[PDB]
């Protein structure tokens with residue numbers, strides 16, 4: 001099981017950005033795919049989660065108008081578009097699958113994708 | 122809902138140590154499905170336990186989940202040198218998850 005996310009991104013404030021998470025080595029539709037925000041000194045912070053089978057979602061009230069979780073079943077990938085970017089959105093975003101039939105536990109995480117919302121000088 | 126824990130703990134090699142995960146709203150129940158994750162250096166995350174006490178495949182059996190009083194817990198019976206890492210928990214509110222501050226375990 002491997003969750004290979006996209007490389008480091010550089011994007012201006014106001015613009016949008018699309019991150020990825022190509023899952024492999026297992027049944028993509030069997031597991032969920034959460035998303036987390038790790039900033040320095042803030043620990044972890046929940047964004048949401050998506051069931052690939054049906055594309056149903058459940059967001060945090062803070063990140064309801066920020067993130068956009070979707071999937072592509074053929075490529076077994078999971079995306080997350082962050083819009084209206086600011087200095088607060090500068091964080092390493094991960095993707096962590098979860099078994100949910102009987103019990104809800106994490107297992108395999110991604111390497112992370114460092115996002116830097118930097119203005120053009 | 123703020124998720125309180127201990128800021129940091131310090132166990133010796135071989136000794137037992139008990140982390141915790143308080144909830145601000147009230148006592149932690151089985152409906153919260155208390156999760157646990159270990160962040161080793163170089164940004165290496167690995168989910169240990171979830172749904173209170175149900176372990177994931179590939180996770181060492183020394184890690185165990187329970188409801189001690191009004192909090193969830195991660196008892197590391199027989200701590201290793203490789204266990205030296207941060208430990209975030211995550212309680213469920215009925216519609217989303219909420220992570221805590223984290224607990225930096227330091228094994229001597």
Ligand SMILES: O=c1occn1/N=C/c1ccc([N+](=O)[O-])o1
Pocket residue numbers: 049058104154156213217218
């Ligand atoms: O849609 C739902 O209804 C009841 C649980 N549920 N989804 C669930 C959960 C539960 C826990 C987590 N979790 O740990 O992130 O997602």
